[PDB]
Design an enzyme around this catalytic site. Structure first.
Site, PDB file in Angstrom:
ATOM      1  N   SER D 371       4.569  72.675 -29.260  1.00  0.00           N
ATOM      2  CA  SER D 371       3.837  72.670 -28.002  1.00  0.00           C
ATOM      3  C   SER D 371       2.360  72.571 -28.336  1.00  0.00           C
ATOM      4  O   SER D 371       1.801  73.487 -28.944  1.00  0.00           O
ATOM      5  CB  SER D 371       4.123  73.926 -27.182  1.00  0.00           C
ATOM      6  OG  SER D 371       3.283  73.997 -26.048  1.00  0.00           O
ATOM      7  N   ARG D 372       1.729  71.463 -27.955  1.00  0.00           N
ATOM      8  CA  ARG D 372       0.334  71.249 -28.306  1.00  0.00           C
ATOM      9  C   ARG D 372      -0.626  72.073 -27.461  1.00  0.00           C
ATOM     10  O   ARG D 372      -1.819  72.112 -27.773  1.00  0.00           O
ATOM     11  CB  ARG D 372      -0.015  69.768 -28.189  1.00  0.00           C
ATOM     12  CG  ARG D 372       0.813  68.875 -29.091  1.00  0.00           C
ATOM     13  CD  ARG D 372       0.500  67.416 -28.845  1.00  0.00           C
ATOM     14  NE  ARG D 372      -0.932  67.160 -28.916  1.00  0.00           N
ATOM     15  CZ  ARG D 372      -1.559  66.751 -30.011  1.00  0.00           C
ATOM     16  NH1 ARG D 372      -0.876  66.547 -31.127  1.00  0.00           N
ATOM     17  NH2 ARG D 372      -2.867  66.543 -29.992  1.00  0.00           N
TER      18      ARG D 372
END
Ligand SMILES: Nc1ncnc2c1ncn2[C@@H]1O[C@H](COP(=O)(O)OP(=O)(O)OP(=O)(O)O)[C@@H](O)[C@H]1O
Ligand SMILES: Nc1ncnc2c1ncn2[C@@H]1O[C@H](COP(=O)(O)OP(=O)(O)O)[C@@H](O)[C@H]1O
Ligand SMILES: [Mg+2]
Ligand SMILES: [Mg+2]
Lengths: 345, 50, 469, 517, 348, 50
Positions: D371-372
């Site tokens: 998850s950026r």
């Protein structure tokens, strides 16, 4: 959950019977529309209404159809334009059998050019100096023809073309132009149009013989061979120019549909005078007071002088429908009934 | 859960029965008007009050 | 008149020209004639496309060998119609509704179009009732849904036809409704075999067979599934009693659709399939369904091209099913029958709330053991079984015995082994595999688990091999 | 009883007021038709993506425009198209109705209800191709969107305004992940707070009809249909419907997002939309590229997924969270459409069949999932108790080769092995049972604080279950102040530790042994 | 009069017909108008092919929804021009040069065409030279080239944006230079994030942002790199200033070129990329070089499809790269910043 | 059915090189005399398992 479910089914068929009553009531309204459609008085006493609603809705800047020019891509538009108005120059100089024999000349000029496409290619190659190509065509057919024809034939292959058969139908365009200029000299330009349009109606809804005039694999004369057979079957086609025109297209149909070809020619006929043609459907024929208002207003709308055509059909059930260019104004009670049916809740 | 769901099952069952009883009584008692409003649109489409 | 004229004949695709205003609607059935004395017949062409300038591109349902350009084409004014009613039970039909064992039968029945719309969304309801067959691997790992959609996915020649005959024997023989069998583009020998088998098992009086085989042009193989599906839809909507619908190789539908696609003038998609693969498959599969209160237990064999489950045709068929039994050639090569891949096969009712928690727990433990065995297999092949844990050696023994106990002697395999088949109730299967995963049979050899029924046959074959249980 | 003359007089209302004067229209004519595409001569003024009306209420979309014809995609009932019919112009590009009456309904990719519960009262209309919020119209993703799934909410957190891809082979549990993310917003909806309510849109593209029925049944049994719309393009619908369905679902939920509301949208199997668009573009004879995709398919998906945004405060502050689903083949994430959607989105959740068979469910590969947005999409308590979790599992995964030789390992190595086994058993979770964020904080506290080293690995789940049960009944104050303050201060941790010890001395393992340190 | 008109619209590909003596150059920027008030806009078409018969095939840089056949198309007489000067610092632009944070800013600046030639052969530097950044790991184990290309393999959460800010600061203070950031296929969320981060760190006054975002047709995603490169080329040639150009995901430039090639009907090459892949990458990377004592150094994020370094896109990109900086997460968890993997980085 | 021949099995000395794991006949015992059907009953499955 159940409380929601049985209410859903309630809503479901209550909608069902809702729309059912709607539809049967609207076709009952159609039943009533019929007993009102019986007499002629109210038929025209509603076409007047339609023509008033037309009186209220102008204008629009529609374009004139240059029939073959609309089929053109660039650099054929230019050639065809200035060649056809060059023929506008040429046609001043002639007399009756002058341009009827210009037809006789040019139509078989087109015949040959079509059947031998090989040299059609060579006189079509848009290289700059036409002189070799004018030499080609005149060396071919100088001793074949009168001077004006190979004249504007030089003028024809002089200009560059976007395609190959484009030039053969350019020369057939100028063929038509010639014959209709003759009909103009004879003062017969309204009668030629009405003959052509009535014959359109005569032909297309009789397609079994219309398709017959379509087998290009048959030697070409064969088709017009039959055509004259039917046409002067009785000659209340009271004009011969019409015979020559449709004869020359029967001569060079090249797989086109006769059903649309002859009306294409009726439209180049009416466009030569510079007026757009409008096609109208009705339930019964109209007065010339109705024709006056029709031509009058639609000319006001399209901002150009117009002529009208009729295709009477009771099935449209009163009112009128007009088609111009490719747009439509439908006020027939049939379409309105269909709309009322199609928009039920 | 099953008491509730069987209850609602036959609930909507004879509910459905009452649905049809209403339905086809209304199916006829809604015909006397086939005239009235048809008239309306028959003129609303024609442009004269007739 | 207003009849047409053949213009082009390029294989099974024929172009026709009609007079202006007499163009037939899409999917109409046109009749043409082949007059050559040895190949004389009547071609039925289905209108596929409107080409323009009054041309119409159609697909022939019979071979066009002997067709002449310019012959007359008659427009029947309606689509292809097949007979429907209680009178089609007990007979074999074409894709066009012509009875085969009695030509001329059914000419007077009600005829239904083979082109219909799927049921509306408001009549659809999920089906979560288990259909108990009697096979161990099926009843345990992919429990079939009653009134739902079932498939047997498989490569070329793994178990599909044998398993579908087994399911005809198990589900349909003592079934209280009407069965319909559609052999879509399959072998004619197998069709005759099934006809005779249903005739001797007294199941034929309840079945309506519809056959379009591999020797037929692609039009017949495109429309035979629709014909049999129309008969089944009549049985579901009008008669309303518990339809069964078997379809041998629904993949032939897609394949026939792809054989004519470029001839119809369509750019091909990824793997040479028609660009309209998913949508044609959805228009056909959404009609194979059960509505609220009306049941159709559907079962389809699905050919997987070159054992590749990533091929677009099976990959698209996957999304239309409630239970998929996926056969494998790695399991076929080991002699395990039915050659079901337990780690890929699936079901939507393998749920703690539907099949119960014991069934679910046993199935999950079987799957976990088999997955760990598959993970270890390469290490075992290279470094040998002695390099594993004792935990893992125990698991490997249990997993081999489980992999062998999932196989079974089926009733429809007595021709390949000479040994009659067996039935195992679902509770006996759950108990047996619970004992297997706990380790109660770690002393019985690997065999004696191979091609047997329940636990008593396990005991018998173990004593035949010198072991207790 | 039923509203009888209400019915008949409603329709008399409709007709008496029937006014459709003779307007001038611009018509064309069908010149050919096949496989769902129709070419129309005429219509000089038709614009790209314009809706066209064929005879019989059939609708098409003008896609290809050239000097001869207009290539249009028939939007259903294609078998009624004939050469020579008259095509009328609408003057409008594709738009859909939008409003609050869409909550609890199942609609076409046109705004038409297909569940049969009557018409949908519409607030406004909204065009399908309205542009995404500007680069300056946005705001940093800062609020969490709780999925109720420990693996996601702890390892790959999702924010409000983020694009999280759910990608997996098949039968791996992607639809289950998204349905549980939907069901988890039930308690946020019950709160009646417009800054905490999350409206959900579930787009179903190319699915079997009974599958959509089952998803709706699952969302009803969880009470989640008070705030959920379903835009269903069943497998029987046309290719145009499957191509338009996510744009319809995104036009709805953009009305809400711009009204200052928070929405979640699930595009189930964007792969089927890509294949429908490939069908359309190949039937229109557009140049094919890799895997025969038109060449603007990346644009097809990125134009859709960039409309999921977190708006600034001067635009209301609304948000649209996206959960596009991609179905791979044989775990080939290097395919074309997987590559595109992995490139587009803000994070990925890779579900695998091998993990699913080993009992790891949800089968989320926490090694490759990402998850950026990260810790910005978490509350303080979860950011604290789960920052320890990633490298715990890394160490466990690189140590599990020595599972049979724990006697030969160092002290810390065997410690990491046991802790990793416990933590893997911790992230497992049943289906349709999402947990609020406070219970997830407590469970991951059990995991990472070490209070599971005494429990057998085959007893963690039940243990955790029972403990949460106990805490929901006896000590609700811990969960309450975690929920209210978003942080687990040291005193709450003290009380929680004591609660855990008491429950331990009350808990009985399955082997009969003890769980007390 | 001298204006064209639309003839065909099939997606982002628009064919336009002009009078005989008014056929526009290749790469010219034409302006068509969409007047449907829901989607009213001004399409910027870019001439791509001359089809004969006065027809030209152009790629639209905006979506063509709502475009009508026959609408007037005005020719600008030049390619896509971006505003240049020092006034482009501290602002965000798109591939066409429109200011995104302050619309209408830069309309009065000098404009430069984004299609330029690389330096002449007699003007290139023959001797390579090291760019002393001041970072110990970069200066020692991975010496950057002055006027060269540097791949940057930093993932998420490894401090890649911090390293971008660091290089911005160093080039702006140790070299008195500037920075241009090309976001090719840039996510709008991360674009806004980078904007506000540079504004907070006060290094926006030193940087020009040019974003070609992901929700745009492949034309702008293909031309945004050239827009940013033209701004940097003005800073180097005309201002006389060392520039640092950040091209984030050069692979998206390659991919946009591939998509534009597929849209234009060209036959695909090996794997699937455009037949002119090497030529496009060359015409882009050849302009990033050292010229007459000034320089343009580039730090480029590269995506490797399927981790295949033999794939045509990374095999073509790496022909121009001079150094490599891999940001490791293991090094980031140790608190070592910058988290440059020392054994896995490299320099030529 | 199919009789799949392999070059590996050929070189190993197995001639005919029929791969018994994949070779099959879809007619089976009906294509055999009764003696051979009883004698060679489960030979193919036995050899695949071996
Ligand atoms: N957390 C879970 N625990 C246990 N079982 C699960 C879980 N999630 C999903 N499953 C099971 O896995 C099966 C497949 O789930 P699901 O339908 O969500 O996968 P999918 O990605 O939609 O696959 P497809 O789209 O190919 O149908 C379901 O039958 C469900 O019962
Ligand atoms: N249960 C079984 N027992 C023994 N042999 C089997 C079994 N199932 C399949 N076979 C063998 O596999 C062959 C092909 O099976 P079949 O199902 O007809 O293939 P397909 O799936 O291609 O139709 C059969 O000839 C049969 O000999
Ligand atoms: Mg078979
Ligand atoms: Mg799913």
């Amino acid at each position: 959950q159940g409380a929601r479910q049985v209410d859903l089914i309630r809503a479901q068929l209550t909608r069902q019977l809702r729309l059912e009553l709607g539809h049967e009531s609207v076709r009952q309204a159609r039943e009533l529309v019929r007993n009102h459609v019986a007499d002629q008085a109210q038929q025209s006493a509603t076409v007047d209404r339609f023509l008033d609603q037309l009186d209220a809705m102008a204008p629009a800047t529609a374009d004139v159809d240059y029939p073959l020019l609309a089929k053109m891509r660039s650099a054929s538009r230019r050639a065809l334009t200035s060649l056809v108005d060059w023929f506008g120059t040429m046609a001043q100089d002639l007399d009756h059998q002058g341009l009827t024999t210009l037809a006789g000349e040019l139509v078989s000029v087109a015949r040959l050019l079509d059947r031998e496409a090989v040299v059609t290619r060579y006189l079509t190659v848009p290289a700059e100096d036409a002189t070799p190509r004018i030499r080609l065509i005149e060396r071919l057919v100088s001793g074949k023809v009168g001077a004006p024809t190979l004249e504007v034939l030089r003028t024809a292959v002089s200009k560059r073309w976007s395609a190959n058969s484009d030039l053969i139908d350019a020369i057939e365009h100028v063929s038509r132009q010639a014959l209709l200029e003759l009909a103009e000299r004879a003062g017969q330009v309204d009668e030629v149009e009405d003959q052509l349009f009535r014959f359109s109606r005569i032909l297309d809804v009789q397609p079994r013989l219309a398709i017959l005039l379509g087998d290009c694999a048959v030697p070409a004369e064969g088709r017009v061979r039959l055509l004259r057979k039917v046409l002067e079957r009785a000659d209340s086609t009271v004009n011969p120019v019409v015979v020559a025109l449709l004869s020359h297209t029967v001569e060079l149909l090249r797989g086109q549909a006769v059903e649309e070809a002859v009306l294409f020619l009726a439209e180049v006929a009416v466009a030569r005078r510079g007026e757009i043609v409008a096609q109208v459907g009705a339930a019964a024929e109209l007065s010339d007071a109705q024709r006056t208002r029709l031509t009058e207003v639609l000319s006001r709308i399209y901002g150009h002088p117009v002529t009208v055509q009729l295709h009477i059909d009771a099935a449209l059930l009163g009112g009128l429908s007009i088609a111009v260019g490719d747009e439509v104004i439908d006020g027939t009670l049939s379409s309105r009934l269909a709309a009322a049916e199609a928009r039920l809740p | 859960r099953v008491r509730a769901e069987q209850q609602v099952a036959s609930t909507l069952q004879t509910a459905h029965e009452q649905l049809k009883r209403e339905r086809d009584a209304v199916e006829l008692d809604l015909r006397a008007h086939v005239g009235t409003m048809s008239a309306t649109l028959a003129s609303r489409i024609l442009g004269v009050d007739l | 008149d207003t009849s047409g004229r053949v213009v082009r004949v390029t294989g099974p695709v024929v172009d026709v020209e009609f007079p202006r205003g007499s163009i037939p609607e899409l999917f109409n059935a046109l009749h043409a004639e082949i007059t050559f004395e040895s190949l004389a017949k009547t071609l039925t062409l289905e209108v596929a496309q409107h080409l323009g300038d009054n041309l119409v591109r159609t697909i022939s349902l019979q071979p066009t060998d002997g067709l002449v350009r310019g012959v007359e084409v008659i427009d029947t004014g309606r689509s292809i119609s097949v007979p429907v009613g209680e009178g089609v039970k007990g007979h074999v039909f074409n894709a066009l509704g012509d009875c085969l064992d009695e030509p001329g039968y059914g000419e007077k029945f009600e005829h239904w179009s083979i082109h219909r719309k799927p049921p509306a969304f408001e009549e659809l309801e999920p089906r979560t009732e288990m259909l108990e067959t009697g096979l161990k691997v099926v009843d345990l790992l992919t429990p079939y849904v009653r009134g739902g959609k079932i498939a047997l996915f498989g490569g070329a020649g793994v178990g599909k036809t044998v398993l579908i005959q087994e399911m005809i024997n198990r589900i349909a023989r003592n079934f209280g409704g009407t069965s319909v069998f559609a052999g879509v583009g399959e072998r004619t020998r197998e069709g005759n075999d099934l006809w005779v088998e249903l005739a001797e098992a007294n199941v034929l009086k309840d079945t309506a067979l519809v056959f379009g085989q591999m020797d037929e042009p692609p039009g017949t193989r495109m429309r035979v599934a629709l014909s049999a599906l129309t008969m089944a839809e009549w049985f579901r909507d009008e008669q309303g009693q518990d339809v069964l619908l078997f379809i041998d190789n629904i993949f032939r539908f897609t394949q026939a659709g792809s054989e004519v696609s470029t001839l119809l003038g369509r750019m091909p998609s990824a793997v040479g399939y028609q660009p309209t693969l998913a949508d044609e498959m959805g228009e056909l599969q959404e009609r194979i369904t059960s509505t609220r209160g009306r049941s159709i237990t559907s079962m389809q064999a699905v050919y997987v091209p070159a054992d590749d489950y990533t091929d677009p045709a099976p990959a698209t068929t996957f999304a239309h099913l409630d239970a998929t039994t996926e056969l494998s050639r790695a399991v076929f090569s080991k002699g395990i029958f039915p050659a079901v891949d337990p780690l890929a096969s699936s079901s939507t009712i393998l749920d703690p709330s539907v099949v119960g928690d014991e069934h679910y727990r046993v199935a999950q433990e079987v799957i976990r053991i088999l997955q760990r065995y598959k993970d270890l297999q390469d290490i075992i092949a290279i470094l040998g079984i002695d390099e594993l844990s004792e935990e893992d050696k125990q698991l490997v023994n249990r997993a081999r015995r489980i992999e062998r106990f999932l196989s079974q002697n089926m009733m429809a395999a007595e021709q390949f082994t000479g040994q009659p088949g067996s039935t195992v109730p679902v509770k006996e299967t759950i108990e047996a595999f619970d004992r297997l995963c706990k380790g109660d049979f770690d002393h019985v050899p690997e065999q004696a688990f191979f091609l047997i029924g329940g636990l008593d046959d396990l005991a018998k074959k173990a004593e035949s091999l010198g072991a207790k249980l | 009883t039923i509203p009888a003359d209400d019915i008949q007089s409603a329709i008399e209302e409709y007709v008496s007021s029937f006014t459709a004067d003779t307007s001038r229209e611009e018509v064309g004519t069908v010149v050919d038709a096949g496989d769902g595409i129709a070419h129309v001569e005429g219509l000089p003024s038709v614009m790209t993506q314009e809706l066209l009306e064929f005879p019989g209420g059939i609708l098409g979309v003008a896609l290809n425009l050239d000097e001869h014809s207009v290539g249009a995609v028939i939007l259903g009932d294609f078998e009624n198209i004939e050469e020579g019919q008259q095509v009328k112009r609408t003057g409008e590009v594709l738009s859909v109705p939008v409003g609050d009456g869409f909550l609890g309904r199942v609609v076409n990719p046109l705004g038409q209800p297909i569940d049969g519960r009557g018409d949908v009262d519409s607030d406004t209309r909204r065009a399908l191709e309205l542009q995404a919020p500007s680069v300056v119209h946005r705001q940093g993703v800062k609020e969490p969107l709780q999925t109720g799934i420990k693996a996601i909410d702890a390892m790959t957190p999702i924010g409000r305004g983020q694009r999280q891809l759910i990608i997996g082979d098949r039968k791996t549990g992607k639809t289950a992940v998204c349905v549980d993310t939907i069901l988890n917003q039930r308690q946020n909806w019950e709160s009646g707070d417009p800054k905490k309510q999350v409206r959900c849109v579930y787009v179903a593209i190319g699915q079997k009809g009974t599958t959509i029925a089952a998803v709706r049944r699952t969302l009803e049994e969880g009470g989640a249909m008070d705030y959920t719309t379903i835009v269903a393009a069943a497998a029987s619908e046309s290719a145009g419907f499957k191509w338009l369905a996510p744009y319809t679902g995104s036009a709805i939920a953009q009305h809400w997002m711009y009204e200052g509301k928070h929405v979640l949208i699930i595009f189930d199997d964007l792969t089927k939309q890509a294949e429908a668009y490939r069908a359309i573009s190949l039937l229109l004879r557009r140049p094919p590229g890799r895997e025969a995709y038109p060449g603007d398919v990346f644009y097809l998906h990125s134009r859709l997924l960039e409309r999921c945004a977190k708006l600034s405060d001067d635009l209301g502050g609304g948000s649209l969270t996206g959960l596009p689903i991609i179905e791979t083949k044989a775990n080939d994430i290097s395919a074309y459409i997987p590559t595109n959607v992995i490139s587009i989105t803000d994070g990925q959740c890779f579900l695998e069949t091998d993990l699913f068979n080993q009992g790891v469910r949800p089968a989320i590969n926490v090694g490759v999932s990402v998850s950026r947005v990260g810790g910005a999409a978490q509350i303080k308590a979860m950011k604290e108790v789960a920052g320890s979790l990633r490298l715990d599992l890394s160490q466990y995964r690189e140590l599990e080769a020595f599972a049979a030789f724990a006697s030969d390992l160092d002290a810390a190595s065997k410690a990491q092995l046991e802790r990793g086994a416990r933590l893997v058993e911790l992230l497992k979770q049943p289906q349709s049972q999402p947990m609020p964020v406070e219970e997830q904080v407590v469970s991951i506290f059990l995991g990472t604080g070490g209070h599971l080293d005494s429990v057998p690995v085959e007893d963690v789940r039940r243990f955790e279950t029972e403990l949460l049960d106990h805490m929901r009944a006896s000590e609700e104050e811990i969960l309450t102040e975690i929920r209210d303050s978003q942080k687990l201060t040291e005193e709450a941790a003290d009380k929680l530790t004591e609660v855990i010890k008491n429950f331990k001395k009350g808990f009985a393992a399955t082997g009969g042994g003890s769980v007390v340190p």
